[PDB]
Structures are given as C-alpha cells and as structure tokens.
Ligand binder design. Structure first.
Ligand SMILES: *[C@@H]1O[C@H](CO)[C@@H](O)[C@H](O)[C@H]1NC(C)=O
Ligand SMILES: *[C@@H]1O[C@H](CO)[C@@H](O)[C@H](O)[C@H]1NC(C)=O
Ligand SMILES: *[C@@H]1O[C@H](CO)[C@@H](O)[C@H](O)[C@H]1NC(C)=O
Ligand SMILES: *[C@@H]1O[C@H](CO)[C@@H](O)[C@H](O)[C@H]1NC(C)=O
Ligand SMILES: [Zn+2]
Lengths: 596, 195
C-alpha cells in the first residue's frame, strides 16, 4: 500500500472518530449555552478537552504521512489541515508561556474596569458601561474620559504582554516555515497546485491594497460629509480640514460609524422603515419569524429546515431561573443536527438576524456531505458574507411589502433612499479603512517593519493618514491602544471583515442579476428566484473542498475579490455625497490634533 | 395452519449489528405477507423479482429473514448492485436478488441520550463481501506493511466502528431496523406457501 493509500485509510478512521467526538462536545457546549449551571461548565470542559486531546493526537499521526507523496488534492487538503503544528511546533515551555500570555490578555480585556474620579467604587467595565458611553453620549468630555481611561488603564497592562506575544507567535510561525505570524494568517487565502486558481499569501496584501485605493474616493467623501455635520454639532472641537477626533465616532474605537447616524442623517424628518409595530400588531412570535425566514430560503429553491431544527433549537429566551447566553448563533453539531440559538424578540432587527443566522444554517446543510475537515466556508470570509446578503434582501421595502409587514401605501422616495444608504455606509464603508489600517499595522509589526519604540507613534500616524482619525490625547509607548480592541488582545485575525464585505456585494450583485432585478442594486430582493438559489447553492455545497477562487467564480463569474459591486451598491450615495461636499473641504490634514 | 414466526423477527427487543447480521430460516408454516406490505408502518418496502402485491399466492421451499440495524442514509445500500461501507463490508445482496427489503426508523428504540453504542459496522476489510456473506472477525486491520501484533497503532486499526445513536441526530444518522426476506426455490419440497 502506497503512502497515499495509507493516508486515505487514516483519514477514514479520523472522520468516523471525529464525527462522534465533535458531536459530544457540541452537545455539551449547547447544554451550557442554553442552561448555565456549574455542572454544565464542567461537562462542557470535559467533552471539549477530550475533543482537543483527540485532535492533538490525530495531528501527530497525520504528520507521519508526508504531503510530498500525495497527489489526490482533496486528500492533501484534509491531511494538511489536520497536520498543522500551530503552537505545537514550539517547546512545551514556550507554548505554556504563550498560552499564559493569551489567557492574561483575554482576562484583562474582559475584566478591565475603569472608575470615575472621586468615587473608587463607581466603576465601569467595557461591556456594558464604557460601550454605553461611546455609543450614546453626546458629551465631549464624557466620551473623552471613557476613550482615554480604557486605553490608559487596560491598554497599558496589555503593552508588555503584547510585546512578548509578538515574539512567541513569530517563533511559532517561522518554525512552521512562514515569514512571520502575519504571513501565517494570510495562509487562509493560499491556494496551490490548481492551474488557473492558485493564490499566494503575498497576493492578499496586493489585492487588499489595490481594492482599497478604489474605496478611498467614496470614503473621503463620506469622511468629509460626516466631519462637516459633526463640526456643526461641535464647532469648537472639530477643524474643517483636520482628522476626526477618535473619541467622537460612535463606539470605543470607531470600528463602525453606525451611531453617528442621528447627528449626520441627511433628511431628519423622513422616518426609518421600522416594521416592528406591524409585527406586534399582527401578534407575531419567534416561531413566525423563523417560519418566514424558512419560507424565504424555500422560495429560492433551498431545502426547508430539518425536523430536529424546530425540535432542538432555542428560538426564545428560556426566561425564568434557567439562564442562557443569548448571542445569536447557528450551530452545526454534525450528524445532521442543525440548530439556532437565539433569544428572539418581536422586532425588525431580530427578524433580519433570523434570516442571517438561517443563512449560516443553509451553508452548513449544503456542505454536510463533504468530508468532516472540509465542512466550512471556502475561506474565512465566505460564511459571514452568505449570512449578510440574506438580511440585505429581507430588509428591502419590496420584500417587507410582499410578506404583509410594510404597507402597500408605502412607496420609495429618493430622500429615504439616501437616508438608508448613508446608514449603511456608516457601518459598512466606515469600517473598511479602520479594518485595513489595523491589519496593516499588525502585518508590519509581525514583519518587523515597526520597532517596539515606535509602535504607538506608527499606530497614530497610520490612523491619521489612512483612516482620517486623530487621537484626542498624545500616547507614548506605554500605551497599546490596538490591543484595547477585542480582536487584537484575543488573537483573532481581522482582514476577514474586509474581504467578507467585498464578497457579500459580489454575491448580492451576481444573485440579483440571476434574479433579473431591475433598478439600483440596493433595492434587490432575490425571493422567488430559483436561478439565484441554484447559483448560490453551487458554491455552498463546495464547502472547503475547492479553492476559494473557484468557489467565488461559481457565484460571480470571477476568480478574485472585486470592489466594483460594493461601489455599485453605494453609487446613489456617492453622487449625493459629492454634491453635498461641493462647498466643504474634501480630504484631511494629518498635523491637526485636538490637543494642539 | 402453522403461522410463520414473523413476530420474532420484526418485534425483537434488540436487533443484530449489521456486521453480525442475524438470519432466521422460516419453514413449514403459513406466511400472510400482505399484512406487512399493507400495514403502513415501514418507510422502505421494496421487492425485487417478486411483487409485494398479493404474491402470497406462491410457494417457496425456504424463506430467510435477515435483520440488522444501520443509519437511515445507508438503507439505500441494501439493494442489488450497490456500493458503500455496508454493501461492501457488512451485508451484500446479489445482483439477481429475489426478495424484499423492509426498513423502518427505530430512533425511539435504538437511540439514547449520551449515545447508544450497541450497534457496530465493519469500517475496513481487505476485500468486498460475497453476496449473503458474514464476517464477524476482529482481526486488527493492517493498513501499512508493518505487522500489527494484534493491537491497534500506526496504520493498525480495529476494523469495527460503532454508530453513536443519539435521539437528536438527523434522520440520515438515525438508526433504522432492516428486515431482508429471501425467497429460495430449489427442486424440492416447497414448504412455505402461505395463503
Ligand atoms: C438545567 O441543567 C440541570 C443540570 O445542570 C438539569 O438537571 C436541568 O434539567 C436543566 N434544565 C433545563 C430546562 O434544561
Ligand atoms: C481522491 O480520492 C477520493 C476517495 O479516496 C476519490 O473519490 C476521488 O475521485 C479522488 N480524486 C482524484 C483526483 O483522484
Ligand atoms: C420539508 O419539505 C419536505 C418536502 O420536500 C416535507 O416532506 C417535509 O415534511 C418538510 N418539513 C418541514 C419541517 O417543513
Ligand atoms: C409486532 O407487534 C405489533 C403489535 O403487537 C403487531 O401489530 C405486528 O403485527 C407485529 N409484527 C409482526 C411481524 O407480526
Ligand atoms: Zn453571522
């Protein structure tokens, strides 16, 4: 028996063993997440520890089959995915050191508190205390106090840990034969040995930067309109040519500009479409919301939900004494067990989230027939892109009018179109320079292009230049402001939010063309289009079995990330923005700061 | 009027594992086949060669009842000319099979919270099964070229794997009880007629 035949038989055993061990751990995790008890936290840990131990042992056995003697690519994909050392290429001492660093940074972030001057007992955590300030307060000094205190008391604790974290992650990555830890992260997009579909780790940098140049004009005009509006609210705090103060952006970091809508809304007399009142008027419950979402997917040719979905999911707060983690989640437990966990209220927001989460389920169901290790999105940005396009269609006035929640006597006027597109751009476009800027700094740190004694200097240089945002207080190298964001202190890659944003509009544009939608892309609803459903399913059932370049070509006809669909979606706003900014300054000087 | 003992096959407390499938030779009795095919408790009831429709009008020399448990997605493998882990390594029907395959979902009986591991199937074998063959061996499967010495290790796998039947699995993963009726015809007695 050849080495490839041995790997096929080894993967055969793994798939059958993993399927049941993963199911047990998912079952125990589910029971804790829907019923919080001490008994459940232990059972969740015991089943999780066995599954992790099983993975650790199977990774070692897989390393005894060298990839160099395998030709069948679908075998090489699974063998490689399981083979990956991870932290286990380091000595046990450096691994243990690194795991201690990771757990301390996570604990500092989640238990970091800030107390108000003159009451050392009135203290706030990030969630909900500081986040409430940064999303709701209009008082300049309150927002400034929360922004600076978070970074001065929690960020400074993270600075020495993050330095050591960089050193150990880079050793781990270089021992796995990557240039650095950022190169390791870019490996999620790597494709090799498929003629015409290959993709290198360095090509991601070039494609992100190339497509970001095309985003700059829309962002510059969004930045200029937002700055002018804020300058009217805060005339003594905002320069007409300067960057936006970092603490005036709607959350703790300006990751999203969503909460600037009330001060920036173009036409403040035309109300939002808010369909929650009609839902309560018609006595909708959670089951109706998820039944409508199921109808939506069935209308485009996708299967209905399984019987176990309706029996085993948790679609309402259990309420009472029995407690549950209510963050909406789609569960793929394996063995044909698909569930949604969601404390659904009767609101338009939760109606859209249900379509989003059921989109995840449809993706999970479609690649269930793939081998265990290929049961995932084509790359890190596919799953979330599939979930987002479902709420795009479900939220349109056309769709809300066909399900009887939006009055037939509501017609779209262009002023409500601009309000909607501006709300969308505050969240979707606003985050793109923030996301690119943050990952770039991490990539340069891991690469070694930024010395330790210039980490914060370069962080705020790039914030000013790329994002148009300025720090309200100067920060020396005792700060670690990037680590004050969850994803950085908790060791999660961040470019996925950039790539997913471009994918979702490529998906939506392709699906809406297959649905023969006429008019602006942002009004499209793919309901009742089995042609759109088939084009999406052709990608969904691939899972991870094909290169992401090919899976993307299945839906959109192109092999690469493309920014044009995103620009097409926001074009009505772009034109209106450019006319609004005729007598404002467009662009920003980087030398102005609020501390003068 | 000796009635064919079909109740002991269909209503057994526990079924056999498919790798160790059970055979019950039925003889010298009267089979009311129609009662099964026209009872609507089965999800699968497909006959090959014979016709379910009132062919309780024929005489056979011996009737064999094979019974076992598999997952629902594997019921498709109990048929002539099928491939897969069940058809190749556990239970193989011939190309010219004359008989019926009966199956029903047994999630209420053969699943258990935490998992029912009573039922096994053969995951590895050096070759495929001849029709109506039964391999109950427990030899460690040699996947490489180094002898196993009767224990599992690198390239050495225990050949039998367990289904973990949990009540919350999807239908494709839920247990199904299967009865396969063979109708034999030799130049001899003809003892099972059954009006
Ligand atoms: C909650 O968990 C306990 C064990 O921790 C269990 O006995 C109880 O039945 C559970 N309740 C619900 C409603 O699931
Ligand atoms: C790879 O192996 C699987 C099963 O071992 C087989 O079904 C598939 O056709 C093979 N692909 C190639 C290209 O040989
Ligand atoms: C799903 O649709 C199938 C028909 O394709 C039907 O047999 C089944 O009962 C449906 N189940 C649910 C939960 O809607
Ligand atoms: C199994 O038991 C049920 C209920 O007693 C009966 O209706 C059925 O006929 C039995 N099965 C057979 C094969 O007789
Ligand atoms: Zn999601």
């Amino acid at each position: 028996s050849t080495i490839e035949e041995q790997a096929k038989t080894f993967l055969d055993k793994f798939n059958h063993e993993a399927e049941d061990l993963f199911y047990q751990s998912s079952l125990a995790s589910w029971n804790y997440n829907t019923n919080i008890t001490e008994e459940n936290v232990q059972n969740m840990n015991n089943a999780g520890d066995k599954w992790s131990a099983f993975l650790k042992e199977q990774s070692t056995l897989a390393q005894m089959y060298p990839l160099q003697e395998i030709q069948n690519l679908t075998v090489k994909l699974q063998l490689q995915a399981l083979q990956q050392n991870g932290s286990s290429v380091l000595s046990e001492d450096k691994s243990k050191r690194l795991n201690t660093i990771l757990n301390t940074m996570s604990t500092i972030y989640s238990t970091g508190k800030v107390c108000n001057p003159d009451n050392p007992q009135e203290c706030l955590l990030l969630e909900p205390g500081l986040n409430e300030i940064m999303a709701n307060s209009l008082d300049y000094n309150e927002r400034l106090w929360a922004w600076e205190s978070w970074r001065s008391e929690v960020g400074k604790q993270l600075r020495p840990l993050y330095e050591e974290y960089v050193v150990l992650k880079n050793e781990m990555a270089r021992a796995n034969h990557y240039e650095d830890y950022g190169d390791y992260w870019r490996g999620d997009y790597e494709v090799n040995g498929v003629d015409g579909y290959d993709y290198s780790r360095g090509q991601l940098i070039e494609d992100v930067e190339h497509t970001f140049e095309e985003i700059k004009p829309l962002y510059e005009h969004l930045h200029a309109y937002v700055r002018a509006k804020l300058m009217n609210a805060y005339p003594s705090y905002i320069s007409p040519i300067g960057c936006l103060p970092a603490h005036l952006l709607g959350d703790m970091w300006g990751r999203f500009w969503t909460n600037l809508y009330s001060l920036t809304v173009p036409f403040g007399q035309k109300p939002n479409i808010d369909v929650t009142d009609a839902m309560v008027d018609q006595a909708w419950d959670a089951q109706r919301i998820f039944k409508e979402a199921e109808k939506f997917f069935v209308s485009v040719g996708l299967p209905n939900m399984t019987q176990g979905f309706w029996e085993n999911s948790m679609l309402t707060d259990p309420g009472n004494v029995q407690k549950a983690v209510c963050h909406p989640t789609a569960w793929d437990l394996g063995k044909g067990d698909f569930r949604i966990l969601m404390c659904t209220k009767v609101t338009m927001d939760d109606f859209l989230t249900a379509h989003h989460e059921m989109g995840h389920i449809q993706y999970d169901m479609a690649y269930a027939a793939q081998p265990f290790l290929l049961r995932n999105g084509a790359n890190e940005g596919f799953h979330e892109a599939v979930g987002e396009i479902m709420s795009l269609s479900a939220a349109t006035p056309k769709h809300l009018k066909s399900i009887g929640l939006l009055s037939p006597d509501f017609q779209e006027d262009n002023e409500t179109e601009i309000n909607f597109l501006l709300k969308q751009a505050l969240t979707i476009v606003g985050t793109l320079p923030f996301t690119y800027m943050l990952e770039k700094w991490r990539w340069m740190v891991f690469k070694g292009e930024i010395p330790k004694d210039q980490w914060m200097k370069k962080w705020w240089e790039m914030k000013r230049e790329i994002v148009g945002v300025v720090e309200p207080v100067p920060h020396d190298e005792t700060y670690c402001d990037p680590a004050s964001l969850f994803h950085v202190s908790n060791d999660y890659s961040f470019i996925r939010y950039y790539t997913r944003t471009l994918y979702q509009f490529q998906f939506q544009e392709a699906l809406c063309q297959a649905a023969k939608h006429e008019g602006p892309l942002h009004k499209c609803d793919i309901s009742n289009s089995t042609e759109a459903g088939q084009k999406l399913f052709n990608m969904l059932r691939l899972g991870k079995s094909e290169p992401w370049t090919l899976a993307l070509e299945n839906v959109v006809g192109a092999k690469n990330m493309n920014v044009r669909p995103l620009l097409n979606y926001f074009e009505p706003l772009f034109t209106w923005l450019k006319d609004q900014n005729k007598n404002s300054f467009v662009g920003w000087s980087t030398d102005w700061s609020p501390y003068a | 009027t000796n009635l064919c003992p079909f109740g002991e096959v269909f209503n057994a407390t526990r079924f056999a594992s498919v790798y160790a499938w059970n055979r019950k030779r039925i003889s010298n009795c009267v089979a009311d086949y129609s009662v099964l095919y026209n009872s609507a408790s089965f999800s699968t009831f497909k006959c090959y060669g014979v016709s379910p429709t009132k062919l309780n009008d024929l005489c056979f020399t011996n009737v064999y009842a094979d019974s076992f448990v598999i997952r629902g997605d594997e019921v498709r493998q109990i048929a002539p000319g099928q491939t897969g882990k069940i058809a190749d390594y556990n239970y193989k029907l011939p190309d010219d099979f004359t008989g019926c395959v009966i199956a029903w979902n047994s999630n209420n009986l053969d699943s258990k919270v935490g998992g029912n591991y009573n039922y096994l199937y053969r995951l590895f074998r050096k070759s495929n099964l001849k029709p109506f063959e039964r391999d109950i061996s427990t030899e460690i499967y040699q996947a490489g070229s180094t002898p196993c010495n009767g224990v599992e290790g690198f390239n050495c796998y225990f050949p039998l794997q367990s289904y973990g039947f949990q009540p919350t699995n999807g239908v494709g993963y839920q247990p199904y009880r299967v009865v396969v009726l063979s109708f034999e015809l030799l130049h001899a007695p003809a003892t099972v007629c059954g009006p």
